[PDB]
Ligand binder design. Structure first.
Ligand code: 4GW
Ligand code: 4GW
Ligand code: BHE
Ligand code: BHE
Ligand code: MN
Ligand code: MN
Lengths: 289, 296
């Protein structure tokens, strides 16, 4: 459950935080709306694990494996078992057009997987964009009565390192790995005013990646419904956003500030971008395709 | 109100946050449990003002002026009018044993003041400590119906710069000006194991000041009730914590991590501690108080 009040921790021994000697001096670790930006060195996972375990937190993880992308499921799930919310309750939701093709993956205690049979759209853009509709529909159908938080990710990925409760919050987005160091005028936001995803050159905080977002079930339901509705308006008006669901995701988080922002540790492509000094860990990374 | 969901902001024009060039590199701006530590340069007040105005946020501000401390009210309130939550709904709660001694202070629109007549304890230590009980009591009687957030401060103080919605969060404490740079072994926590407020030398994140804490009414009710109950246990055990209510506040916040921590910008004594480079603003500062002293 998501507790309405602070929880009481037991005695713990850990290094004292030092007010005058911050660990991370190379990156911004808080947004101008005072949401943490999550990098290695900014959190003590022991304290956070205690806080969330004490609430018996259940985390849902949605992933779409439509048509040939079912091939990505084995590695995705096997590596999630090693790295994703270990110690906590996890409910995987696998959206697929081929239930029989979902690999048999052995799960740790307290972890379960549900297979959701869905339509396969012809255009890859529609497969990607319709995720918003399908998530929003299932936020109502299932997630609201089943999980506390939802984490929505791409399937063509693997976990290489810890992805834990440090990300959980009412609403989070993730810094796109290609653009975290870019100026806002360079962001590939939708720039046509005719699109609902329109963002002018003088607005924008970050470029968030469509491959990793989440939050409380109610905030994710609102986000996904909003994005789908905006995409349908665009479709009626004969327009498709330059980067599809990601463009609408970016318009949504511009107007509704996320309560945490994940660093590109959480969404990386080592093949395309290497391993910069600013990344101490590569947590969730692209698989070649 | 406290909105259940994220609010939708209008178009705004402001400088882009730079991921690779943080403004404050001289201080910790986030705790190990991912709570912001609030310093100048860490927040855009226009964005936060929009977020909170859209929820029609009402902030309560509690202040005790018992016995001679009524002398501090005029300056406290007059400076609060200039610096505290300007633009937002504010409700001042003045707890006092002398209702008639509360000065007339002209208030801006959307701002109001209530005088809460309470008992005056003989010992100054009890006057200070019983604030917890009194705050908790009135949370049930008044605050839950009247405000969204409660801010609880010492009266022997004045505002000198902005104190606004950047501080608002479910539960917050403030870095004590004397110890923000100290190691935990030098923190003046209660060190007696027999005290409910006991914290050993290998525990502790920060030393928070008893003069400035707050949060949602519900969290403040819980904190003040817990601190009062702890003090009553100590009393029954013939124990009084070394720094009274502040010792129990520190025990409580050690075990229930605050969702924001305020920098000593928000609790300072310039006469005693000067003006270190790390403080770009002095927002809420000590006023001389030796003349209002009353011998037990
Ligand atoms: O051959 C072109 C394709 C582009 C996307 C395709 C696709 C994507 N997806 C899902 O949408 C997500 C986004 O597509 P993508 O990973 O290929 O997009 P990018 O991360 O490369 O921008 C995938 O991770 C899957 O979850 C599918 O399940 N089946 C698919 O056939 S197929
Ligand atoms: O002569 C010794 C005294 C110590 C505290 C006294 C006192 C405090 N108070 C309140 O307790 C708060 C804390 O006491 P303090 O400011 O004097 O002490 P510090 O906590 O700053 O060390 C004050 O700000 C007032 O709100 C009173 O209302 N009346 C008082 O007579 S009197
Ligand atoms: C230095 C100048 C900017 C250089 C930027 C280089 C990475 C570009 O990235 C693409 O960015 C698009 C938005 O503009 C979409 O997010 C697309 O899905 C993404 O590629 C996806 O994510 C990438 C990380 C790769 O994994 C690619 O294979 C994916 O298709
Ligand atoms: C390692 C060197 C540490 C050096 C610390 C120097 C400041 C000490 O401060 C006192 O600290 C106490 C706890 O230990 C209480 O909070 C007390 O109320 C406070 O004095 C109050 O606040 C002060 C700022 C002054 O305004 C003083 O007049 C007040 O009575
Ligand atoms: Mn992908
Ligand atoms: Mn004081």
């Amino acid at each position: 459950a998501i507790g309405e009040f602070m929880v009481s921790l037991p005695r713990m021994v850990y290094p004292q935080p030092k007010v005058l000697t911050p660990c991370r001096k190379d990156v911004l670790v808080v947004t101008p709306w005072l949401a943490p930006i999550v990098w290695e060195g900014t959190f003590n996972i022991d304290i956070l694990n205690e806080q969330f375990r004490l609430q018996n937190t259940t985390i849902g993880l949605t992933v779409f494996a439509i048509k040939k992308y079912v091939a990505f499921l084995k590695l995705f799930l096997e590596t999630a078992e090693k790295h994703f919310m270990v110690g906590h309750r996890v409910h995987y939701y696998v959206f697929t057009d081929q239930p029989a093709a979902v690999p048999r993956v052995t799960l740790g205690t307290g972890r379960q997987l549900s297979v959701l049979e869905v339509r396969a759209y012809k255009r890859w853009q529609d497969v990607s964009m319709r995720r918003m509709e399908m998530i929003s529909d299932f936020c109502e159908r299932r997630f609201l009565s089943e999980v506390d938080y939802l984490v929505c990710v791409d399937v063509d990925m693997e976990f290489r390192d810890h992805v834990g409760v440090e990300i959980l919050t009412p609403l989070f987005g993730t810094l796109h790995p290609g653009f975290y160091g870019s100026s806002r005028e360079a962001f590939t936001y939708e720039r046509r005013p005719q699109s609902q995803a329109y963002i002018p050159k003088d607005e924008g905080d970050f470029y968030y990646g469509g491959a990793f977002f989440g939050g409380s079930v109610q905030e994710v339901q609102r986000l996904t419904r909003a994005c789908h509705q905006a995409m349908m308006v665009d479709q009626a008006n004969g327009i498709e956003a330059v980067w599809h669901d990601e463009s609408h995701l970016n318009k949504y988080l511009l107007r509704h500030k996320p309560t945490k922002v994940l660093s590109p540790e959480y969404l990386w492509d080592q093949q395309l971008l290497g391993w910069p000094a600013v990344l101490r860990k590569l947590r969730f990374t692209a698989v070649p395709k």
